[PDB]
Amino acid sequence: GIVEQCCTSICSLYQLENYCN
Amino acid sequence: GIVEQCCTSICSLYQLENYCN
Amino acid sequence: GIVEQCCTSICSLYQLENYCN
Amino acid sequence: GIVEQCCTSICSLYQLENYCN
Amino acid sequence: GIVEQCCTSICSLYQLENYCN
Amino acid sequence: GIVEQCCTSICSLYQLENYCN
Amino acid sequence: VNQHLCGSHLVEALYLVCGERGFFWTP
Amino acid sequence: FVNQHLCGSHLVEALYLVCGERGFFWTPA
Amino acid sequence: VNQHLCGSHLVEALYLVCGERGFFWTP
Amino acid sequence: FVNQHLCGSHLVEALYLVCGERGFFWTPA
Amino acid sequence: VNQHLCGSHLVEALYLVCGERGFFWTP
Amino acid sequence: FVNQHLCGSHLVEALYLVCGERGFFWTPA
Ligand SMILES: [Cl-]
Ligand SMILES: [Zn+2]
Ligand SMILES: [Zn+2]
């Protein structure tokens, strides 16, 4: 999920974009 | 939509939770 | 105070509302 | 009030601290 | 400037990075 | 730098103002 | 009212209001 | 509503939303 | 100017400016 | 783009900016 | 559109977008 | 003024308020 990927780990812009619609 | 209902008028938290899942 | 209750501990919406006017 | 003084014009931090306790 | 380009229209992150160093 | 001075250490308003233009 | 800035405030507010249940943002 | 720690400007904004026209007092001392 | 959004920014700014002494928000 | 931990309303706002007109889903569960 | 509030949102957005490289804010 | 740690977008916004029309530079490197 987004919290584990981008809040506990660091996300790239692409990983962050996996959560767009 | 949320933008029309809430950007000209003030929405409370009770009106805002309408837009939750 | 509000910092001990809601920043060091977690507050419910009602506890948070104890600090409204 | 703070809304009328500061929402049409820019208030500095010095003007804003007027509204502190 | 950034204020004129982006405060009336929406700037994307790609348009915004123009203003980075 | 500003991160070491004001994020890892605490800055006064004057130290914070060292980073204005 | 600039809809984009308002949107920013709206998704913050919805963060707080919705909490666990979350929300979909679809302009 | 969110069940979590709220601090600083985040706590203040939460009070803003939740209290509405009542307003609030922010006394962190 | 939407007074509510401005208010949001105002209470943030007052958080910073007032610090320890705090403030009352009374629309 | 920033390379760092993004949490809570910060993460949400980041999604807002990055996703733009696509919008996004915020499912923290 | 109140340029000052928009500015607030702009420097936040630029924080995210620019990251390491940073930016200059010069109204 | 607040006497505390200011980081990330919080630090940036603080600079925004405090510097005003002078503007500021945000060089976190
Ligand atoms: Cl705004
Ligand atoms: Zn705003
Ligand atoms: Zn924060």
Short mmCIF file of C-alpha atoms in Angstrom, two decimals, chain L residues 4-25:
data_model
loop_
_atom_site.label_atom_id
_atom_site.label_comp_id
_atom_site.label_asym_id
_atom_site.label_seq_id
_atom_site.Cartn_x
_atom_site.Cartn_y
_atom_site.Cartn_z
CA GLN L 4 10.93 24.69 17.68
CA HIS L 5 12.21 22.45 14.90
CA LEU L 6 10.93 23.42 11.45
CA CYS L 7 11.42 20.97 8.60
CA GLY L 8 10.43 20.44 4.99
CA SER L 9 7.42 22.30 3.67
CA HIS L 10 6.89 23.63 7.20
CA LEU L 11 10.29 25.33 7.17
CA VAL L 12 9.62 26.62 3.64
CA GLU L 13 6.28 28.15 4.61
CA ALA L 14 7.91 29.70 7.69
CA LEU L 15 10.48 31.37 5.43
CA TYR L 16 7.63 32.53 3.18
CA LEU L 17 5.82 34.28 6.05
CA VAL L 18 8.94 35.66 7.73
CA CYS L 19 10.71 36.95 4.61
CA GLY L 20 7.68 38.52 2.96
CA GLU L 21 8.40 40.70 -0.06
CA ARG L 22 12.15 40.09 0.24
CA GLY L 23 11.49 36.51 -0.70
CA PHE L 24 13.94 33.81 0.28
CA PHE L 25 16.20 31.06 -1.01
#
